[PDB]
Design a protein around this nucleic acid. Structure first.
Length: 49
DNA sequence: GGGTATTCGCCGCGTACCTCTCCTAGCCCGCAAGTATCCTATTCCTTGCAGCGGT
């Protein structure tokens, strides 16, 4: 069902797309994985240490 | 006495850092505050003794 939902949108079903480096501007081979992840900022700051 | 087994009691169990809270109990005696009470006046009445005109 993840594959089906992905294909509902026009995204590549494999889950991995092809990026481009920022500095050089040339392509990464080996298509990489990109998505959306939920992240939290834990209560261990640097300025309290 | 003596070689042995069984029990008793002491010794020991990682490093560094960050955050928070809490730290004696009970009696006693001076003492401030607040209060109910006691003495202090005024107005009426009916006595008891000293002056006092009068003769």
């Amino acid at each position: 069902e993840i594959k089906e939902l992905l294909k509902l949108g026009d995204l590549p079903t494999s889950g991995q797309i092809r990026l481009y480096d920022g500095r050089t501007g040339e392509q990464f081979e080996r298509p990489v994985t990109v998505g959306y992840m939920y992240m939290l900022k834990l209560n261990h700051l640097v300025d309290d240490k």
